Amino acid sequence: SMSVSEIFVELQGFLAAEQDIREEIRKVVQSLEQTAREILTLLQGVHDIPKRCLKAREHFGTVKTHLTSLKTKFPAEQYYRFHEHWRFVLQRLVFLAAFVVYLETETLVTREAVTEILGIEPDREKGFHLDVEDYLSGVLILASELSRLSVNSVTAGDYSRPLHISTFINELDSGFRLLNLKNDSLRKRYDGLKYDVKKVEEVVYDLSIRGF
């Protein structure tokens, strides 16, 4: 036997506590997004590479700290309750992590490797996980970056990179065809990959026909 007023003062209790957790998260995500912009401007200078990748990995130190700081703000089991607060930045980081590995190794960073770069735990560890959907978004962002690098690369006199970028992006595309995407955001962004494919293939054509 609780009156409606008692019921609502109780609820106000819970809501204020939940609201506080969300505010605490927002602040850390501010810091995360700034470090993330910093990592981006840095890597987008490639448009001395090993130097940028070294500088960028120093910056993932700062990400590791923020991420451990983030886990402190909310209860581990409620990851998906507050997920949308950091969905954007976390996808950028996957992007930037993959981008670094691509510039170092011409290879696609494995999902587990991305967790390790960021701090963060794999699926079989509980506590802050990396979503399959967030990883794939980061990879599609990568592809758009790479198609852009391909054109700037011919600009700067590098005529070998675009051919590697071409084969790589065609790999990603075959990759996605294996998936039967259902998420709308994700099928949307996948639709953009076909334009990146087209652009990069056309860059290599331009190079093959030249000199002749």
Add this chain to the structure above:
Amino acid sequence: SMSVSEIFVELQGFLAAEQDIREEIRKVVQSLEQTAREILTLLQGVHQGADIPKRCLKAREHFGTVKTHLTSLKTKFPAEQYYRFHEHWRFVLQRLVFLAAFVVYLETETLVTREAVTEILGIEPDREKGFHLDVEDYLSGVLILASELSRLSVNSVTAGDYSRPLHISTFINELDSGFRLLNLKNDSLRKRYDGLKYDVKKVEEVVYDLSIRG
């Protein structure tokens, strides 16, 4: 060092598994939504020449069928991942809070407490883990109640009951004061709270029409 091909075949396995989980969820949500429609049609007979305690007993028997579906639903996804698949049952869970609050109102002229809703549904309270009742989902159901009550207030007078509207008016005015205390943030919830003022207005106006008559 996995090739990109190898990476993707792996993800496909994961994605396929999750998608089957979501398809299994949907089918139980169909069933839940049906039972809920059936509990609605049943209680909404109160809007005609209104036997109420009869309606309230047949309704509570159907909550048996709800308890059963919810037990079945828990079967379809891992308990800890409630918030991953929550959106699939957000709608019907809210309807079920509404329906439960509606039954409790008709019996007792009172607002069912959150915990009592969980009991009616065969769901757990917060300190028990496994399938929870969100605060936001509880509140949404209450707002849908308000709208159903304002309608009832009108149909009440038509059916010759001129006392009920008075009761519904103070009830609604208490819920309004209730939300006042809350400093709402969720956008879907603040949107729907904006609707409660119209219900408040409609009910007060019913009461005015009554006081003016004679």
Add this chain to the structure above:
Amino acid sequence: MSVSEIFVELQGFLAAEQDIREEIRKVVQSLEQTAREILTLLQGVHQGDIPKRCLKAREHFGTVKTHLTSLKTKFPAEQYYRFHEHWRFVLQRLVFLAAFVVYLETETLVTREAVTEILGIEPDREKGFHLDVEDYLSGVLILASELSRLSVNSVTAGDYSRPLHISTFINELDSGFRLLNLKNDSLRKRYDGLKYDVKKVEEVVYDLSIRGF
């Protein structure tokens, strides 16, 4: 076969199909006209002799029967669903109008099969031109909106009893729709409209009861 030859063949097939559609359009124009006439006729009820109008109405449905048997001659009966979209709008109007006449006469919901009979169509067990479930339901929702209007207009004209019957009727339709688990989007959209018709009609009755009638 060369590509050229393949395409001269196709042009043959599309030309034929385009002729069927054009033949369909013309008859649907006549149908739509007849439907508009039945509508202006019935809609007189909004000023306050109704059976007069249902009677004039029914005659026009003689014209409807003609146009429909003429429609059946324009396309092969088994391809009903390939050309359905041409008459979707007018068939839904006609269901509305038919239901509207029956309501005015008997205060009841015309059965799907009685609509078929009134329009000179065949039921489901008879093959050749059928009345979709989805088209029937659309016409019923159109009726609900027309009746909520009438309920208002009825009070203006001094009839204080009709609105009470319209309220129970519409509340019955609402309870009917609840049973269905709608999937078609157009139809779910339209169903969302019904709750406003319900509200309007319930409020008319309130206005009457609170002033004693």
Add this chain to the structure above:
Amino acid sequence: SMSVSEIFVELQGFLAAEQDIREEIRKVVQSLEQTAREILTLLQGVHQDIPKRCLKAREHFGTVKTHLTSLKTKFPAEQYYRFHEHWRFVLQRLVFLAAFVVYLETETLVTREAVTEILGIEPDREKGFHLDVEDYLSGVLILASELSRLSVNSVTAGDYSRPLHISTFINELDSGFRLLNLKNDSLRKRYDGLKYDVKKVEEVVYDLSIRGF
């Protein structure tokens, strides 16, 4: 009269029945779309042995035949056009992929009927699962865009002869469509895309000629 309640209870049975039909179709279409995705990755490897890809490809068309026979069981044959939209997309991809194999084999445009045989479907004069003309032409339009892309990649791989064949073939396709008097909007839309494919392949050819090939 049948009361509104009774009418609606009846309808609910019909709607549930139709909804099961559609859900049975969706499942088949998933498998179908998968098989088609596999066929596609398989043939898209040419963008970097051809007869080998064409053999493995037609083995998968086995899987396709079994899925479409499986599909005809899910709905009543005479109702093709009512549930057509469920498989529109994948049927068009299948035309494309069929056509694509035939091009790689014989440098020619698969006939519509040939596409029928390959899929284990019936031609127009047999009753049951048909291949629309409109879906056929969509598949061929899809083919043209694949070929224009192939023409480009063909050059980078060092094949300077294939682009010239693709050029005349695409020009034949463009000639063909000009014969048709297209009326369907989706189709007219996709036809507008062909002129870009034509332009691209004629420009590949130009790039090769001024460099003497």
Add this chain to the structure above:
Amino acid sequence: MSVSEIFVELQGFLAAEQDIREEIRKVVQSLEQTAREILTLLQGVHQDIPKRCLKAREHFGTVKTHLTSLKTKFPAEQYYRFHEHWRFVLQRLVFLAAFVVYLETETLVTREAVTEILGIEPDREKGFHLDVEDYLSGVLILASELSRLSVNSVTAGDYSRPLHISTFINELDSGFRLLNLKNDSLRKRYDGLKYDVKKVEEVVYDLSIRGF
């Protein structure tokens, strides 16, 4: 002719056409001002009407003037070449003409009567016509004004006018149903009429259930 000579010629024709259009514009500004004046004057009824209708009919003297002036600006047989310049104001004037007639007579001005008020010719006479489509638009705009008037009428204590307006508007609605509109703008504007019909019948309802 070389292409040069061809083009200098065409520039001549275009400049000519350009000037005809500009002359049309200046008159149409005058027309639109006179129309605005007639509107403010008539729109006083929302707060003596045989006075308003008089001062209004004097102004249609100024309208006749501008229209005869409009005839001199272009070749009469090319009406539809430059019709779009005055389409707006011609429909306003139809509306204003119909509005005056309604406040005097409670009736719908015929199209031939509107032509007379404006100093325009009827279809059987050649030179400046009044389109069927333009007439119907004016009538649609009239319906909206009358639905507003119905509401203000109640506020000012006149409980009879709304009854007449409701009958009128229902007659117009009956009228349009007979038409098989094809023009998009016109079908579009016809869709508006159902809201006016609704509003007006509801005003009357409000009156009936309170007894008037």
Add this chain to the structure above:
Amino acid sequence: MSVSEIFVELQGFLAAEQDIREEIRKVVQSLEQTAREILTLLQGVHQDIPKRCLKAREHFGTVKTHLTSLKTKFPAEQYYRFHEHWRFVLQRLVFLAAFVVYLETETLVTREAVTEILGIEPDREKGFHLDVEDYLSGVLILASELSRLSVNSVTAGDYSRPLHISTFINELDSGFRLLNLKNDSLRKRYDGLKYDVKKVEEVVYDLSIRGF
């Protein structure tokens, strides 16, 4: 007259007009087909030219018949009320005629010469005219066709034609510069001409740098 009566009259006028429109469609259908055929015929040149040019001109016999036929379908003085029904096909026909004339004589068909080939009248004879905006539209279409031809010409090994097409197109560009364009569809299409100019200029560059 009652409103009822008024509208029953207007439906009559609307019906007669809709009918005129329907009759125009049907002949425009035929016209559009004949126009497609002349095109398929002429576009063979992208792989015996005076053969095609002749075969074309006999097809303009069948357009002459379709245009005299169209003049049957509406009252001559109302040309601009029904203009939008043949705007497309009229412009294609301008194009096709100019195209023919260009292949014969490497020159721009004068506007009056286009009127003659179509069996229509000049501006000084009344009855079915050729709009200046329609002719310019045809000419701009021609320019696009010619830039394509310039490319295909090289492919078929003709290394003189592009130089002719290049000065031709440059003359057209100098001509539109004289006009002060106002209609938007035409100024829109004029913006396309710069690309054709660029295309053909670069074809010639290609040729010059490899010596022809």
Add this chain to the structure above:
Amino acid sequence: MSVSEIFVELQGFLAAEQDIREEIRKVVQSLEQTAREILTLLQGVHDIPKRCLKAREHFGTVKTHLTSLKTKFPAEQYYRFHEHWRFVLQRLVFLAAFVVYLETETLVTREAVTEILGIEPDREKGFHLDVEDYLSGVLILASELSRLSVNSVTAGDYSRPLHISTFINELDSGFRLLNLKNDSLRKRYDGLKYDVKKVEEVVYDLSIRG
């Protein structure tokens, strides 16, 4: 001059210009804040002479800020940097007009608005109040008054709406005189008819009650 010299000079000027713009924004932030404060406290009407007084005290803060704003850029270049303060200046016109309406049930004249804001008339040079900015303020006013009309009712004041009706119908009659040409302004003018309709309908509701 070589091209690099020319461009290093241009850099000079753009930087200077960019500093002027940045100095402006910081003043406009302050301005927009004090404006929100004048609004939140006036919309409290949803005791009036007290509110109108506290409101006029806050315009003190506005005068100082606009004086401060004039120091950030050369006066003759008013229209170069006008778009930075277009929004807030129109809000202030609205708020000024709103105050004057609550006080006097009348339409603040343009020159009275300059006086309230500590701005100069057209015939003085240095910081002016645009005719289009004034008209936008007045259109904002009409929308606020239509909301006020509805809330006035819920608070039991059944005479105010009738005043608001007459007022807004006056405005409408005024705009009808204007031959607007600016698109933004014509766009907002189209909004006025809805406010007119709303207010006339509130009065309707009152006359038929009950």
Add this chain to the structure above:
Amino acid sequence: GSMSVSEIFVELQGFLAAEQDIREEIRKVVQSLEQTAREILTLLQGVHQFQDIPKRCLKAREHFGTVKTHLTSLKTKFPAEQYYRFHEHWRFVLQRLVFLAAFVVYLETETLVTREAVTEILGIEPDREKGFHLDVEDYLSGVLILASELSRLSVNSVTAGDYSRPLHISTFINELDSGFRLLNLKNDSLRKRYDGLKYDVKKVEEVVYDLSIRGF
């Protein structure tokens, strides 16, 4: 005194009509300008077909005589202090003129006309003078238009057999690109148009490349 709504609005109508008249007067002047501008353009663009340039450069400077008269004419139409209120009316043509001025100077001296020199060619005043100024944003727009015209020229120059011009145009455009790199552009029209420069840089360097691989 104190005014009714009606009185307020009648006054405002006076001001609006007056401003609209100012705008209408500006347009008529701008038409003239735009025509003179087209003529200057058709005259210079003759270079795309070369041996005769200093003649074109003179006739062109003759026409700038007509431009100066129109602009002195334009300044009468509106109050000098209100430049930015009516600026958008002549933005387009003023940028054209910047281009056409910069173009003649390039053909004469192979140099980038200084901003003040263009003001002198148009009969306008420099920044320290008050009355009709040349915006820095408009100047740069004209320079960008120049770049695209020079890239076009580069290509046609090769066709006409002049293989030394393209190498001059190359270093020039590359100097332009280096210039903009120094500016921190903020205006969106300008940053959009800058984005086009990279295409003219690309095309002119490609021309240079084609030349070198054939020994020139």
